[PDB]
Amino acid sequence: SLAPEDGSHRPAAEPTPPGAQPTAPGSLKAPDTRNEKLNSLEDVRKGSENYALTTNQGVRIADDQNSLRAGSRGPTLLEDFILREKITHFDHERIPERIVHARGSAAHGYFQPYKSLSDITKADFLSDPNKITPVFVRFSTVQGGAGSADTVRDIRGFATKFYTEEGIFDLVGNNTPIFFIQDAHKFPDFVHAVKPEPHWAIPQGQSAHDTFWDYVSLQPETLHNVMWAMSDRGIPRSYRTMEGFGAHTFRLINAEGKATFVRFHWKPLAGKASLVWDEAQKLTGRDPDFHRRELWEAIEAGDFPEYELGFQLIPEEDEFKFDFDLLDPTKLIPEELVPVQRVGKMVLNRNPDNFFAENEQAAFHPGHIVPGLDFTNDPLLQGRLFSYTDTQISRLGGPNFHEIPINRPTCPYHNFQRDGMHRMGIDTNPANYEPNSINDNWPRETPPGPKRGGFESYQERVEGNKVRERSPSFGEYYSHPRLFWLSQTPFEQRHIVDGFSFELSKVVRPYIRERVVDQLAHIDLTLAQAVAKNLGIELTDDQLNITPPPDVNGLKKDPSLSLYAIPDGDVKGRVVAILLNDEVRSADLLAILKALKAKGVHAKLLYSRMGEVTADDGTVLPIAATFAGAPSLTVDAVIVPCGNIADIADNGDANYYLMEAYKHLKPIALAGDARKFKATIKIADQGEEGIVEADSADGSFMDELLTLMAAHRVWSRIPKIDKIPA
Amino acid sequence: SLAPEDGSHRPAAEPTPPGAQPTAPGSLKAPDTRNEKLNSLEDVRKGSENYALTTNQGVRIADDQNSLRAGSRGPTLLEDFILREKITHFDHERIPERIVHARGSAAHGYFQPYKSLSDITKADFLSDPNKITPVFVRFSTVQGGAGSADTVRDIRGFATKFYTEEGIFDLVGNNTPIFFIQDAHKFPDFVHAVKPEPHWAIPQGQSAHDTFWDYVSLQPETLHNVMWAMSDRGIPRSYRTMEGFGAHTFRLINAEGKATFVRFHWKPLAGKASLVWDEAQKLTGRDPDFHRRELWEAIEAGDFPEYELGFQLIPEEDEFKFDFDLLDPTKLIPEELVPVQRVGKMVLNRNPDNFFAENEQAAFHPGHIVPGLDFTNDPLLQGRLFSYTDTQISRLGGPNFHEIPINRPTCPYHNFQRDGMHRMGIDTNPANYEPNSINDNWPRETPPGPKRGGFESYQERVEGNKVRERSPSFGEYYSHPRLFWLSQTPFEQRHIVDGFSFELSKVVRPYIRERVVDQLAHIDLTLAQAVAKNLGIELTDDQLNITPPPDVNGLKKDPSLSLYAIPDGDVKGRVVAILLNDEVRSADLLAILKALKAKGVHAKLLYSRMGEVTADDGTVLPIAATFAGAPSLTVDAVIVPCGNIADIADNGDANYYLMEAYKHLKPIALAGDARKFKATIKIADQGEEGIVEADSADGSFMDELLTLMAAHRVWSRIPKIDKIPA
Ligand code: HDD
Numbered sequence A, B: 001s002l003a004p005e006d007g008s009h010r011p012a013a014e015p016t017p018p019g020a021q022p023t024a025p026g027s028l029k030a031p032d033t034r035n036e037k038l039n040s041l042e043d044v045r046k047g048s049e050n051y052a053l054t055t056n057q058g059v060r061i062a063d064d065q066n067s068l069r070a071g072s073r074g075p076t077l078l079e080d081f082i083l084r085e086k087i088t089h090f091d092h093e094r095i096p097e098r099i100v101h102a103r104g105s106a107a108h109g110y111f112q113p114y115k116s117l118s119d120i121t122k123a124d125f126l127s128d129p130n131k132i133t134p135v136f137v138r139f140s141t142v143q144g145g146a147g148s149a150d151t152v153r154d155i156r157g158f159a160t161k162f163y164t165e166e167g168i169f170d171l172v173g174n175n176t177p178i179f180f181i182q183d184a185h186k187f188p189d190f191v192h193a194v195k196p197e198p199h200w201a202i203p204q205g206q207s208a209h210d211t212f213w214d215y216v217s218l219q220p221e222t223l224h225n226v227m228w229a230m231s232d233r234g235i236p237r238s239y240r241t242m243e244g245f246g247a248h249t250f251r252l253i254n255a256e257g258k259a260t261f262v263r264f265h266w267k268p269l270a271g272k273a274s275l276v277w278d279e280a281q282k283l284t285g286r287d288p289d290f291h292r293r294e295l296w297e298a299i300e301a302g303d304f305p306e307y308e309l310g311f312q313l314i315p316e317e318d319e320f321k322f323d324f325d326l327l328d329p330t331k332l333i334p335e336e337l338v339p340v341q342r343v344g345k346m347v348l349n350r351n352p353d354n355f356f357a358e359n360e361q362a363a364f365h366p367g368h369i370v371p372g373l374d375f376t377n378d379p380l381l382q383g384r385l386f387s388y389t390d391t392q393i394s395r396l397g398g399p400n401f402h403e404i405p406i407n408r409p410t411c412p413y414h415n416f417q418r419d420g421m422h423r424m425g426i427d428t429n430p431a432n433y434e435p436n437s438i439n440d441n442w443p444r445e446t447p448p449g450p451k452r453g454g455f456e457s458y459q460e461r462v463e464g465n466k467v468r469e470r471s472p473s474f475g476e477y478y479s480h481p482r483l484f485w486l487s488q489t490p491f492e493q494r495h496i497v498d499g500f501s502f503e504l505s506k507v508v509r510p511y512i513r514e515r516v517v518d519q520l521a522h523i524d525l526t527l528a529q530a531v532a533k534n535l536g537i538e539l540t541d542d543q544l545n546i547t548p549p550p551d552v553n554g555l556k557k558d559p560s561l562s563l564y565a566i567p568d569g570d571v572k573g574r575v576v577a578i579l580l581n582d583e584v585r586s587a588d589l590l591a592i593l594k595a596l597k598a599k600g601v602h603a604k605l606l607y608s609r610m611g612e613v614t615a616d617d618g619t620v621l622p623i624a625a626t627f628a629g630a631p632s633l634t635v636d637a638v639i640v641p642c643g644n645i646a647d648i649a650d651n652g653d654a655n656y657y658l659m660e661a662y663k664h665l666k667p668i669a670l671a672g673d674a675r676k677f678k679a680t681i682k683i684a685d686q687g688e689e690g691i692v693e694a695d696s697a698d699g700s701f702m703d704e705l706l707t708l709m710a711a712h713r714v715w716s717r718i719p720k721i722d723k724i725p726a
């Protein structure tokens, strides 16, 4: 019942490209990768090799194949305590998934600042460019269950737990710089509207349904984040290729007590890249685990996800200086007005050992701040502070959630709190209260100060009556949506139009579509007309006369809002499909593989069956997957080397592979006789931008392909795709 | 007052076909559809129209848009009890999902027997053909979470709660007649192996991964249910078009105390029908809720799902008369040996009101039997009896899950059990123990009897030592897989071959593929060779020499094991895509639509945009969805009426629609000029079986199409589709 004699059951404990080895728990794959937090989990990591199988009580089991019965065809006996322990534990494996962001993928890593920020913050983790702070990061979707798909259109979560020497700091952000709503009190209304509808629990992972567009049409504050969700930001290529944002204005507090307003940013060093909608959708079926898998494999390959932490900083005296309210989380701060200052780099360099223990049980909460940080009055942030503590009581079984290993501080924690379900800490303090004389008052309060001080809130002035009232300054809904729209490239605009058109086409009640289109007419008439057309709606004269909203502080556009306007391509960690034939020209493959390796681009070798093919020079080529098993959806570009092309010329799946990649705007490269495939995707003999062709795969051929891959997708091809049946 | 003044926000309370109206809670959609259980839920149904919005304590809310703060831009106050109640309930909405069958869709209905079964069972619900028993049924997948996709390849659950006059009877079955393993002690090993792998939590909703095939390769008892899952059984068209089975041998006990062994069956009156793999997988992406949705809409349309309950019955004296053990749940009872006797009909005729409250909280458990039934020593069933009670303690929060309204018996329940979390029932009995004199010993035990008696177990003889030992009678693994294989049509066999080839191709460790192939070589060499070819694996002479397993009691096949060998087509409730153009020939549409209506087949009118198109004669045609919005995956056939075909002849989506429908073997009909599309799918001028074509949609056109639909798919097309790129 055992391992194969060759040791091929066990993956190498070395960095390896996606698909080369089976994936494995982080500590077995990369045992020499360490940080303070990873090491501190060693008390609870449990091995297996050479150990006897036991009950949870430590009793060795002799027969784990059978229940205890009265004769071998008889009834099962109640005294079989081994069976009931095993079954009882199985029967209770599940815990409540998170209310929102139930679907997510996580990894370990570390953070360090570029330079001390003690001028603006006394936060210890930002005080020294050579103090490393471990992190645990969870990326997520928002609406779907823990078993929903990755590549849905949705906001993405981006939560980072920093295990600092002065306490845990959780920066709990999303991949867009705003949220749908203004006050936490409306959170259950918004989330109930986007979630599956309550009578039938449909649809999963989709805002494309009546209730969501109902709420949107009636709550125009939502339109800004909806524009982002309908843009390609809603369907990222990978969690490594999206931005992160804290959304709210927080405060930094320095040693001298000065407060500075701050918004948080994460910049992806692998660049910004998203899928296209037909590709993302079809991908939730071909591989609902695509982003989870891609993150885990990138880490196993050494393509560590890296992010730059950046701050937008606004002096206190500048609170009222924009034409929007800094505390309104439906408003972004344009980088043209306030630049992002580089703060530090985060590297994710190890996967967890057990998803449930480390990922599913992790609890992030934006109230977990540290000295040198503070809140503001943002009314959405204010209510979040209540929820993230409260929800852990059911999700994680009670108030000792900070004792679940993933959640534990690596710095000291001591206080007079006691008991609770599943209490691990055994307190020896004679006192469980303070003030106490019986333990000389320990543990003791600590005055605030420059470093290692107690937490004291910034003494912000509060003046007003007790009111349930929206600030009048929040009552503007169109100008940020319009600034975002004007900042996208024409093809990004087209995809926004297509997203609204596609979603609203799935709204059954036509008046809801109409009301949404009327809201679009208040943002931008070209957008509104283009959506209306697709819905067979005609704008009224009044609608055509709606005055567009004002510019944002004089800005006609801000290109930092676009995924693609300013190139920031990085091909390392991307992947190519190489479509094999039964007689590959080995000279082509040599050159292809060598150029890709030089840029850290991975390859997957595909064929019409599994096993091996032999190349022209006798090289045996192992096959990663079939053309159907690993579709073009899962790769960044497609290369077809020369060889016996007749072998694959009339294979439907091979031809379709190229048609799907073509439709989805990916680079394709055809060497020698592989150019016969140009007829399948209707390329003229002259060739075209985005299809690489030559007599063979040489220096030039690969350089070309790699240049296209750095530009991500071939946007100039878009007019040519609506005619192809794919 | 936000409803549209035309009342179009509210769906009509009358049966309407899929897509015609928004879906609704069953009691608002079909208020006159009643049964005793639905009626008994009235005490907890909560309405809404005309009511003031309140806290849960009944306090009217004035402003549900804002938190209470100090100043309208000030901090949120802890005294906002309205905010905290509303966020608290939200923060705790989730409960743990089911350990297995997390993904399920459910409906209300009723059951009635055809005639009294008093001669063979004293079960009250089967005693009288005029006794109607309310039921609640949940259908499910097995592996994936509650938010996973419906049309995965997996076993399906089919669980029926009968609310009988003598107690709840739960018939908790699946859509295949056996299970993967023999003894309940291995259920967590099997389930852990099929579920997402523990390091990374991948893959969702798929057995296509290493650990599953590792376990199967090492436990040949699994192979029979694996054959079922690899066939088109693993991807049903609808919950209305699969079979249901209790799997285990149970007992019926009559008034005279005679036991008869029984296996339970559900026959779908809508026939057996499945998807094909490429369609199924793509549909998990285009509509992960397809089966849930199809069930709900069939019920709203009046196409109620109906099933006939049947029994395979075996006298006690025949226990040992088969080549396999009756208590072995890896073995089926071939209907050629033991016919299914028709017992009664179940009709599902109303959707729930609230999915969480009725579907998510429902608790089914096969130990919930009633006098007139009993168990056997089947060692899988024996362990199930422990699990389904235990698991509710966490899932539903304690031992009072029977007081959750969907779970309550409709008949009396009284006992001495008290307290527990969530206790609803307020006991007034002076006594909470028996025997007692202080309440005259009430409630009292009831002797067994012909009717309305207490439950007494059949006094089966037990003789043996206390052993953890598998019966040697269970040690045969191959002959049932082989009988199943030999019973399939050739196209079914090919689909089995492709299901194994596709799954093993996702298994990263090659030695596991090889070991599975070797197991197949023990079942049937043709199967094993065909899967080996697809994997690039060469059978050894030893493997080519393995002698096949014996016939099952002289059977070389049983056609009842095939989905399609014996025609059982039913078109009612199926759906057709109609591809419109901007000037449709109205006479064609009249003929098509009326022909479909007469046979209970639905239509969806599709185009390149939403809104309307106008026919030749000026009739205005409402568009249901776009070609891309409602892909051919979601229909059973496609009809292209004549008109201005030039409108759509160059539309990539229109073309691809037909290519996808064609690849997946679906009937396609083309009228007048729509026949120019013949070139898109490569049909010969003189046409082919499975393509209907004529000058118009008059005469025999619609009959020919409906005939194809009654046969489900165009299996003869299979050799044609391999070369088409779609
Ligand atoms: C007042 C309610 C509330 C509102 C207004 C917000 N959140 Fe939240 N959030 C929760 C209440 C909550 C929560 C219900 O507490 C969750 C799910 C359950 C839990 O553990 O946290 C959560 C989870 C959650 C996660 C997933 C953390 C993880 O991976 O485990 C992220 C990334 C965010 N939130 C980010 C945001 C952003 C960017 C918001 C707007 C700027 C926001 N939340 C507003």
Ligand code: HDD
Binding pocket: A087, A091, B098, B099, B100, B101, B104, B138, B139, B140, B156, B157, B158, B159, B172, B173, B174, B178, B179, B184, B187, B246, B247, B248, B329, B362, B363, B364, B380, B383, B384, B387, B388, B389, B391, B392, B395
């Ligand atoms: C000893 C463990 C055990 C084993 C051997 C089985 N089950 Fe089971 N089953 C459970 C333990 C369990 C459970 C974990 O207790 C579940 C999930 C949560 C629940 O309430 O019951 C369940 C759920 C469950 C459901 C879903 C009910 C619903 O819709 O809520 C169905 C249809 C079945 N089972 C059917 C089967 C079949 C056909 C089996 C093999 C013949 C089988 N079970 C063996």
